[PDB]
């Protein structure tokens, strides 16, 4: 029930790269674990976004 929250946040990231977004979601599909690691990558690159 925590992984689905990460699915919601990454899927609703405002200005994420669509190819990178599919990679974050696909990594959340292959292994529902590491939910904090993928959200960390998403927040890391979103903070560097233009």
């Amino acid at each position, epitope marked *: 029930k925590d992984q689905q929250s990460a699915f919601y946040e990454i899927l609703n990231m405002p200005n994420l*790269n669509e190819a990178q977004r599919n990679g974050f979601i696909q990594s959340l599909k292959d292994d529902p674990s590491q939910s904090t690691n993928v959200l960390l990558e998403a927040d890391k690159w979103a903070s560097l976004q233009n």
Partner: antibody
Amino acid sequence: QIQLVQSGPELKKPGETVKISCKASGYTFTDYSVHWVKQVPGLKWMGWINTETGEPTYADDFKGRFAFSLESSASTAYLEIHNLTNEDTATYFCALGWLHWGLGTTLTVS
Amino acid sequence: DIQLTQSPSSLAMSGGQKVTMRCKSSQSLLNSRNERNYLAWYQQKPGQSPKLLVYFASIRESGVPDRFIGSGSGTDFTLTISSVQAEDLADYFCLQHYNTPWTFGGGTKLEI
């Protein structure tokens, strides 16, 4: 591997113009901004440039003689300083945001 | 503008002992969107470019030894070296990237 490489050291006489390049590799260049930092021999943030649109945003202390530009076909950011003075003598860094810093370029005005 | 006031500018070390450096911001660096504190710690050796040690206040960067420990939230942040080694003799400074005018800490020189 994310890598930033800058141009070599520069020796300039006062009043001239210097242009510093910064070649990037290892990531999508157009998605993440490039920032410029000045290190006097602390650290002072100069500004950033939008990699997608090319629009630069300068700090208050760098609004006059400084200009940021890009060559997207080569993934290279540029820093141009006009009318060089003695205070411009410093090491200039291009940085992929807060993540990765460039190797640096030492400018000496004399 | 957000101002960064670091801890001391110099520190004398005895090999193995713990060293703590502090970074206080005038305003909170915690982003309500992702609940991250937009502050990073960097190590810079003479004649070399700064290296990222900790990002998002307390998250250690890949490749950094686990003795470099960043912590804190809001306005008070600290970078801790559990057992200072000989290869850690360098300058350290914090950086806030919450607002557009990025500001840097004064710098911390680690020497014997």
